[model samples]
Structure formats: C-alpha cells, structure tokens
Target: AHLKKRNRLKKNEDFQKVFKHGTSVANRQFVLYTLDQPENDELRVGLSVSKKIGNAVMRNRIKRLIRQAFLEEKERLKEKDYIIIARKPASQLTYEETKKSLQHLFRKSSLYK
Candidate 1:
C-alpha cells in the first residue's frame, strides 16, 4: 500500500562512501552496487547513466524509469544504499521493460530476498 519516493542522494560523500565500500553486480544492461547503510532509516538510491548510453534527454529518461522501478519494488528490497549504472542496452528499453530488467537483476543479486 505504501510507495517509496525518490529522495535526493544529497551528499557526494555518501555516494562515494558506497562506491568505495559496496559490493557490485553486473548484468547486460546495468551494474548494481549495494552497501548496507545501517545508520539510515530509509534506503537511499542513486542512478548514473553515462553519456555513452545517449544524450542528456535519453539519459534522464532511463534514470526516471529506473527510479520508478525502484519505487515500485522498494518495499521488497533490503535496507541498503544502491547505485544503478546503466549500460548501452539500457537506452533501448521502455520504462516497463527497464523495470523488469532491474527487478530481475535485483532478484538475481539476492537484494530482493
């Protein structure tokens, strides 16, 4: 019944901390980096879509889709920091497809259990 919202990842320090300390998993379309942020009450997520994926508009579209997907599934996820970096194939996907791809990756990574 509850939907998760996209809160700004805010500090570059927080983003960097996760990248440096987290574990990463990759699929054909994206790379997921996850770290436990035990001090925080809400799960924080950040997304990075590279220029290689497309232009600014395309990049933002992918980011938005990913955010929506995370929002839909956030309740099923563990409490952690997550960074989703999109790859080339991501540019070809529609929002719903992107959501499914992310869901599959999250499931495969055991982040959904």
Candidate 2:
C-alpha cells in the first residue's frame, strides 16, 4: 500500500554505494542517482532533502510527495537503489509537480522496464 522498510534505502552503506557507483540524472528540482543491483529483486529508494531546501516542514512535505510519487510509479521501475536529492527549487513544487518531475527523471534515466 505504501513505502515499507523493504523498499526504503536507509542504510548509509547502501547510500554510499549508490552515490559512488551510480549514474546520476537531474533536472532543476531533483537529482536522481541510480545503481543497478541485480542481486536484489526489489526497488529501494533513499531521499536527501537538505536544510537549505527549507525547515523541517517543507523538507518533510517534499519527502512525502516524493515517496507517493515513487509508489505510483513502482510497477514501472526496475530493481535497483535510487537516491533522490531535492534541490532548492523543489520546495516550491506541488505534489503533482513533484510527481511529474520524478516521472520525467525516470524517463530521462530510462529506469522503466
């Protein structure tokens, strides 16, 4: 129904692996970094919204929207680790815009399968 622990890429090592070895694609709102993990058969995502994006509320709001966007697109995504970094402009985005931008990024990166 929602993003569960199994689909969350929360471990520091996992984040580092993706950041260091992944391919990154970006737009003005977000940066999507992806690493293929054939050994793991599920998609896992990690999010990074820095303090510069806004205070706690703004950052959390963006994170929530991003997670929902991912859920909506889950079936089309490949099995891999994705790290989404929110940029300053993303604080101004609505939920639909957030979802659209992420969908664009996924298309740009050819993450669909």
Q: Highest TM-score among the candidates is held by which one?
A: 2
Query: Across residues 1-113, which tens digit of lDDT does each residue of candidate 1 receive?
Result: 32355344656787788799988888888998887877767777888786795588889888888888888877788878888889998897997789888887788778874
Local accuracy by lDDT, each model: 0.80, 0.92
Candidate whose lDDT is highest: 2
The lowest-lDDT stretch of 10 consecutive residues in candidate 1 is: 1-10
TM-score of each: 0.87, 0.96
- Residue-wise C-alpha lDDT for candidate 2, range 1-113, written one tens digit per residue: 67878999987999999989999999899999999998998999999996796589999999999998999988899989999999998998998899999999999999999
lDDT score, candidate 2, position 4? 79
RMSD of each: 2.5, 0.9
Off by over 4 Å in 1: 1-6
Badly placed stretches (over 4 Å) of model 2 are none
